[PDB]
Every structure is written in C-alpha cells, then in structure tokens.
Amino acid sequence: VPKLPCRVDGACDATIIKMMTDLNKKGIKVASVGQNYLISIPASALFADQSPRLNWASYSLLNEIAAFLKQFRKIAITVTSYSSKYVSVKRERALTLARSRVVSEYLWSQGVDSRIIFTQGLGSDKPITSYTLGGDRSPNARVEITFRRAV
Template sequence: MSNVRNFALIVAASTFLAACTNNPYTGESEAGKAGIYGGIGAVTGAVIGAATSSKKDRGKGALIGAAVGGAAGGGYGYYVDKQEAQLRQKLVGTGVQVQRNGDQLTLIMPGNITFASNSSDISSSFYPTLNSLVTVFKEFDKNGIDITGHTDSTGSLALNQNLSNARAQSVASYLAANGVASNRISAFGAGPNQPIASNATEAGRAQNRRVEITLRQL
C-alpha cells in the first residue's frame, strides 16, 4: 500500500509540475497541447527518476525526473502550437497547405502558385506568400527548414531532377536573402520520385508539381 500511495503522490506532483512549467522557448506558461505533452513527459520522467534513485531518495528522484520530463515534453510542442497558428493565419487564401504530424510542420505549395511551367524563377504572385513565411521563420527561429522540390513524371528524369533542385534552391535563396539564417535551411530536389497522386491524369500531375517545406526541431 505504501508503494501505491507513494506512486500516486509522484504522479500528482508530476502533473502539477508540468502545469507550472514555463516554456523554455518563449518564457510563457504552457497550455493546450503542450500541457498534454508536458504531463506525459512529467509522468515518464517521474517513473524514470524513481527507478534510477536509491530507495530512500526515490521520491526526490521522481520529482526531479518529473520537472525535467515535463519541460522536455511540453517545450517544443508548445512552440509548434504557436508557430502553426501563425502560419495558418498568414497563409489563409494563398493555396498553401499547412499539415502537422506530431511536432513536425509541413507546408505544401502547389506548382501553379510558385513557378511557371518548366521554370525555376519564382512567380511574382508568390512573393507575398514567401514574405509571410520569412516573417514567421524569423520570429520562430528554433527549427530547421527543409525545402524539397517535386515534379510530375512528364519529360526525362534528368530534366525533372534538375528542375526540382533549382526550384528548391530558388526558395531557399529567397528566404536566406531576406534574413532567414542560411544554416537552418536545406534544399533538395526529389524530381518525380515522391508523387502524392497518379501521374496518369492532369489533375494528379498538377498535385505532384509542388514545393514542400518541412519544419523540424534543430
């Protein structure tokens, strides 16, 4: 009974500590999804802390583990919450999709709003969207920016590979030229090798012609 009671106290303390943790990136109190992440991290940290401490220090170890686990679990999740909200607000009506998978954000930019056919020159109508991205990326500067160019399967593999490389590099160069730290940015061309729709139809090929930006924790 004593062990059960002690563990219940540890879990309660872990949850409390997670709720009280300030975000290490912004200094704000954590809430929303980050509270869930922090709570999970805190409980996990408490269990590990208790298991790796001597019997007499088990309670102390659990509390230390809870504090560390809560901060680690909640910090970046909260940061991504804020960044996602900013991106969705600024990209309304642009045609850019914002997708989230865990703590990874992906921006999908279809070819019809980014580049002219068979060109790596940024379309003039796309500059306002890129400027919005620059603003958000400079404010939220704690993640890497992976830019990938994609094409459909029309034409030779070499042509498509070169075109996808050039388009990814064009976006990367624009971000860097406007103040986004270049050491955060990578650019890669996938050519036609990562389709998201069938290349047998025009609609499918249009979906495959795209640039994606993936934001990941550094």
C-alpha cells in the same frame, strides 16, 4: 523582469494562429504533428509552366511565408521539390533542383535564423496520388518545406 525579456522577441502566437488559419484559408497546406512542421505549396502557384522563374505576384506570398517562418526558434530547414514526368529523368531532376535552389537562396537572404538550410528536388519519384491528369496542374508537382521546432 525590467532587465530580462518576458518572451522571445517578435512573438504573438495569437497572430501566429491567425496567419496559420489564413494560410490554410489560402489553401497552402499547413501540417502540424508533434514538433515537426510541414508547409506544402503547389508548384503552379509559384512558377511558370516547368520553368525556374519566379512569378512576380508570388513575392507577396513569399513575404507571408517568411513572416510565418521568422517566428519559431529553429535549427534546420529542409526543402524538397517534386514534379511531374515530362521528357526525361535528369531534366526533371535539374528543374526541381533549380526551383528548390531559388527559394532556398531568397529565404537564406531573408532573415530566418536557422543554422542549416538543406535543399533537394527529386522530380517525380514520390508522387502523392495516382491521379496523373495534368502536368504542373497536377497537385503532386509541389514544394514541401519541413523542420523540427527545437525547445
């Protein structure tokens, strides 16, 4: 006990439940089924209008994401990007790929002790609704991040 750690470092699951509740209060989707965890973020809350540029206000949200993400001992994080339909196919594919690349690059710069970060973006191939009113206003244009908690 004086030489062995009583817990994993930086762990306060009370604070984890608090920040998870606060995340859903913000409206960023937190999904927990089994040991697989899903976080979903609307793209309008992250980028400009079909642009691969980070809004400068969003870095606080990103810091909150990393503070949550540092908690759980993990292996692999998958990042998927989804968009609307704007001009062509490969244009949307490229924009999604760039967006997922940027968030993966900043997160891998940050301290999340994964071993694997996979990233891909697919454009508008798997929508989550038939409601297609806006462009980036529509909720299907989004970024999802998934992982499996291990042990």
